[PDB]
Each structure stands twice: as C-alpha cells, then as structure tokens.
Amino acid sequence: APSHVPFLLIGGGTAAFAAARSIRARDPGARVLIVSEDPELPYMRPPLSKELWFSDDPNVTKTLRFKQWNGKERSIYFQPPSFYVSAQDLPHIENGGVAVLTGKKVVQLDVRDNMVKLNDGSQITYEKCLIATGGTPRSLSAIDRAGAEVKSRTTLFRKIGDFRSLEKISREVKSITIIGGGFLGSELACALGRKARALGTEVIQLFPEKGNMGKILPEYLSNWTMEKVRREGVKVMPNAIVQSVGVSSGKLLIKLKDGRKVETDHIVAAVGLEPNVELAKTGGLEIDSDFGGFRVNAELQARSNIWVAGDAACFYDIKLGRRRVEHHDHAVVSGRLAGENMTGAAKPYWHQSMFWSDLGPDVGYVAIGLVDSSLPTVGVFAKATAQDNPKSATEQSGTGIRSESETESEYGKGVIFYLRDKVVVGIVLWNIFNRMPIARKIIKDGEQHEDLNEVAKLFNI
Numbered sequence: 001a002p003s004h005v006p007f008l009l010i011g012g013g014t015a016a017f018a019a020a021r022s023i024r025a026r027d028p029g030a031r032v033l034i035v036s037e038d039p040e041l042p043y044m045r046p047p048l049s050k051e052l053w054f055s056d057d058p059n060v061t062k063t064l065r066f067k068q069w070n071g072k073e074r075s076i077y078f079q080p081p082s083f084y085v086s087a088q089d090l091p092h093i094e095n096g097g098v099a100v101l102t103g104k105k106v107v108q109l110d111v112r113d114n115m116v117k118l119n120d121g122s123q124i125t126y127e128k129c130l131i132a133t134g135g136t137p138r139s140l141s142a143i144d145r146a147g148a149e150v151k152s153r154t155t156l157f158r159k160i161g162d163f164r165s166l167e168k169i170s171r172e173v174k175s176i177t178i179i180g181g182g183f184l185g186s187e188l189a190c191a192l193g194r195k196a197r198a199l200g201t202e203v204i205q206l207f208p209e210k211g212n213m214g215k216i217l218p219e220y221l222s223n224w225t226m227e228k229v230r231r232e233g234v235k236v237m238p239n240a241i242v243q244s245v246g247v248s249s250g251k252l253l254i255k256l257k258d259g260r261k262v263e264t265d266h267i268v269a270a271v272g273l274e275p276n277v278e279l280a281k282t283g284g285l286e287i288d289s290d291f292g293g294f295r296v297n298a299e300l301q302a303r304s305n306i307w308v309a310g311d312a313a314c315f316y317d318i319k320l321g322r323r324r325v326e327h328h329d330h331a332v333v334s335g336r337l338a339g340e341n342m343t344g345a346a347k348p349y350w351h352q353s354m355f356w357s358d359l360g361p362d363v364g365y366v367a368i369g370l371v372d373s374s375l376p377t378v379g380v381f382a383k384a385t386a387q388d389n390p391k392s393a394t395e396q397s398g399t400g401i402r403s404e405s406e407t408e409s410e411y412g413k414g415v416i417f418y419l420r421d422k423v424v425v426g427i428v429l430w431n432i433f434n435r436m437p438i439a440r441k442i443i444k445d446g447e448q449h450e451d452l453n454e455v456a457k458l459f460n461i
C-alpha cells in the first residue's frame with residue numbers, strides 16, 4: 001500500500017486497464033497503480049452475460065476461461081496475474097510497472113492536495129490521476145421497499161460474483177425472473193433460457209415496453225427480438241409495470257399494475273446504471289446533469305491532472321455534443337486516449353463509440369450514435385447469408401469482442417437509420433458486420449438524404 005504513486009487509476013475495470021497499457025507503451029518505465037474495490041483483477045464484462053453461459057466446461061465457473069463463438073478459449077481477465085507488479089514494489093522496482101490494489105475503495109479525493117483516502121485509512125498521493133469508476137446498477141423502488149427478504153433474492157447483474165451466484169441459482173431453483181427489457185436483460189434472458197431448457201426450469205423476462213429493447217429499436221425489430229427470446233423458452237411479458245414485490249410461502253410474488261401476478265424463485269434486475277460520481281463531492285468536479293457523469297474537456301480532463309474515461313465520463317461527442325455511454329468500445333478507446341494524454345498529451349477524443357450485443361452465436365446487433373426509438377426511423381432488411389451472424393464474425397476476426405474486429409477508424413439482417421430531419425444521427429445494424437467504418441463515415445458527414453436505399457447498399461443489403 002504505497003504512500004505515493006505517479007499515476008493513480010481509481011477503479012479497476014476496462015477504462016482503467018486501457019489507460020495503464022497505454023501509459024506503459026508510451027513510458028516503458030512508468031509507475032501506475034490501480035485501486036479496485038473488486039477482489040478480482042481487471043476483467044471485461046461482455047462475457048458475463050454471453051459466452052460464459054454457453055460453454056460445456058463444468059469448470060467454467062472457476063477458471064472463467066470461456067469459449068468464444070468460433071471455439072477459441074479466452075480468459076475474462078485482461079492480463080495474466082503475472083504481468084502486474086505489487087503495490088509494494090511499485091514505488092521503487094526497476095522499470096516500474098502496473099499494480100492493482102484489490103479489495104480497496106477510494107472514498108475521498110482531495111484535488112487541491114493531489115491525494116486520495118482509501119476505506120481502511122490509507123492515504124495515497126498522486127502526480128496524475130484517472131477516475132475510471134464505471135457505474136452502479138439501478139434497482140427499482142418497488143423492490144427496495146419490500147424489505148431485506150426480497151432484496152436478498154435480487155441479483156443486480158454486473159460482476160463475476162453475480163455470474164457465479166446466478167449460475168449456481170439456475171441449478172437450484174425452478175423459476176428465475178428478469179426485470180428489464182434492455183440488451184443486458186435480453187442477453188440474460190437467452191443465456192438463462194438455454195440453461196433452463198436443459199434442466200426443465202422456467203425463465204421469465206418482463207418490462208414496461210411493448211417489446212424487448214423498446215427504447216432503442218422500432219416495433220418491427222423489437223417484436224422480432226421478443227419472438228427470438230420466446231423461441232429460447234422464455235416467458236416474455238411485455239407491458240409489465242411492477243406494482244410491488246413480496247414473499248408468499250417461499251416464493252417471490254410479483255404484482256403488476258395491469259393486474260397480473262407472477263410466482264418466481266429469484267429475480268435478476270437489468271434496468272440500467274447510475275454513474276459513480278461518489279468522489280465527485282469531496283473533489284469538487286461535481287458532474288453535469290443532462291446526461292450524468294463527470295464533466296471532461298476534449299482531451300478527457302476534469303482538472304489539469306485528473307482525467308476521466310469509460311462509463312463515468314460525460315464527454316463531448318464529435319457529432320452529438322455532450323454524451324454518456326455504457327459501451328465497452330468507449331471504455332477501451334477513451335481509456336487508451338486518457339493514458340496517452342497522461343503521458344503528454346494534446347490529443348482530442350474524436351471517436352464514435354460503437355455498441356454491440358449478441359443474443360447467442362446466431363443473432364447480433366450493433367449500434368452507433370443516437371439510437372432512440374422515438375425518433376424518425378427508416379429500416380431496410382434482407383435475407384441473411386452464411387457470414388451474416390456473430391459466429392461468422394468471430395470466426396472471421398478470431399475475436400468475439402466486436403470493437404476489436406470492426407475497427408476504430410472510418411428477413412435475417414438489416415439497417416435502421418435514426419433521423420433529425422433528414423440527417424442520420426444514429427444507426428443500428430442487425431446481423432450486419434464489417435460495416436462500422438461506413439456506418440461512422442455516414443453519421444460524421446452529417447449529410448442530408450432523401451433516399452436511404454442507396455446508402456443501405458454500401459452495407460451490402
């Protein structure tokens with residue numbers, strides 16, 4: 001537990017790691033320390049709701065070495081444990097390196113004095129800081145007022161602990177209910193769905209919308225999505241508003257505003273996240289408003305020596321202005337930029353951060369820009385071929401983390417445009433891959449189009 005560190009990375013996820021790899025690649029003798037309230041070393045989140053549930057390895061719970069869609073085993077951790085130095089040797093070890101203090105939470109940030117306070121009473125000072133604290137899962141108020149009995153049977157899925165505890169539960173109970181129609185929630189619907197078919201148990205997913213991912217996707221693709229979830233065996237209940245939750249003889253009882261009742265053994269909440277601006281009080285960088293997250297400049301700074309990246313960061317988006325994102329690609333790229341800037345410097349974050357989600361090897365979505373379903377939307381669909389699924393894409397690139405394969409620079413499948421007037425502000429790509437460069441160039445040009453079809457042809461529709 002060092003008293004001082006040149007580079008402090010608060011929080012131990014994907015942003016923090018992207019930063020540290022970058023710094024070491026630009027200053028091969030830099031001394032970087034990550035503080036992580038997670039017992040685990042830094043690891044990626046997408047598999048937690050994806051491949052990890054699809055493997056046939058009974059040890060997959062223990063090793064968290066998962067198989068991608070193409071068959072290649074990969075670890076959920078960014079680096080083997082042997083690549084990090086000790087927080088102890090960090091201050092003096094020849095060449096320095098990267099160190100992670102696991103199980104420790106930074107609770108106080110004294111910006112003026114360049115110092116942090118850990119939970120245990122430790123005090124650490126820094127020359128250069130990155131806040132990469134990600135977010136905290138939201139619950140629903142209709143859960144929180146039910147007491148400690150219901151709360152103890154409500155997974156808020158986010159971490160390895162949640163994967164492990166929920167995987168266990170899928171082998172012990174008869175009925176699991178997912179609240180939330182969002183991507184995570186639907187990924188979790190399919191994944192638990194697949195385990196429940198093997199066991200003969202029940203999976204229920206509910207949400208207020210008309211269909212899955214209803215805030216993002218138009219009715220057609222949303223309703224289709226819902227039918228896909230139902231094909232996995234899931235009892236999907238749309239237009240479900242939660243009235244209250246309570247104990248009813250060993251079972252959880254969900255009462256809806258539309259009157260319906262649902263008996264289930266366990267709940268998994270997947271209703272989004274709230275940024276972690278905690279240290280935003282004692283620090284006096286104290287966040288934005290419209291969008292949530294710490295305010296940063298073009299180079300991702302909240303102060304002259306304190307950058308922010310990843311989920312915690314409210315950045316200026318090249319085409320969309322102020323924005324907050326929950327994308328892994330954002331994490332990696334803004335994390336990488338932030339680390340480059342900490343090693344001096346002077347580089348704007350002009351990146352258009354792609355989002356992607358897979359519901360199994362066979363269905364994949366990819367978003368870029370403002371993708372809200374309330375906008376004017378134009379969809380152009382087609383019959384998908386042999387290479388038009390995540391399994392093929394993962395076979396083509398060798399990686400199942402889409403952001404690595406689809407590059408950073410500029411009815412089975414289809415493309416949905418989102419419009420303010422006739423300007424493309426957002427795009428969804430349904431089962432179409434290798435076309436994010438064109439997808440970016442289209443939004444970045446901010447052009448006006450009175451067709452939509454000719455554009456669609458570049459996606460190979």
Ligand SMILES: Cc1cc2nc3c(=O)[nH]c(=O)nc-3n(C[C@H](O)[C@H](O)[C@H](O)COP(=O)(O)OP(=O)(O)OC[C@H]3O[C@@H](n4cnc5c(N)ncnc54)[C@H](O)[C@@H]3O)c2cc1C
Nearest residue numbers: 011012013014015037045046106133134310311326327328
């Ligand atoms: C289950 C799941 C599946 C996902 N799938 C996808 C996907 O398919 N595609 C996609 O684009 N995105 C996906 N995402 C979102 C994506 O993973 C996030 O954008 C990414 O994790 C952001 O990284 P981060 O560094 O901002 O936050 P995190 O990875 O959460 O890292 C923050 C870490 O810092 C810790 N921390 C917070 N505060 C403190 C403190 N004061 N002191 C010490 N530590 C602290 C937290 O415990 C956490 O471990 C998924 C997310 C989840 C949760």
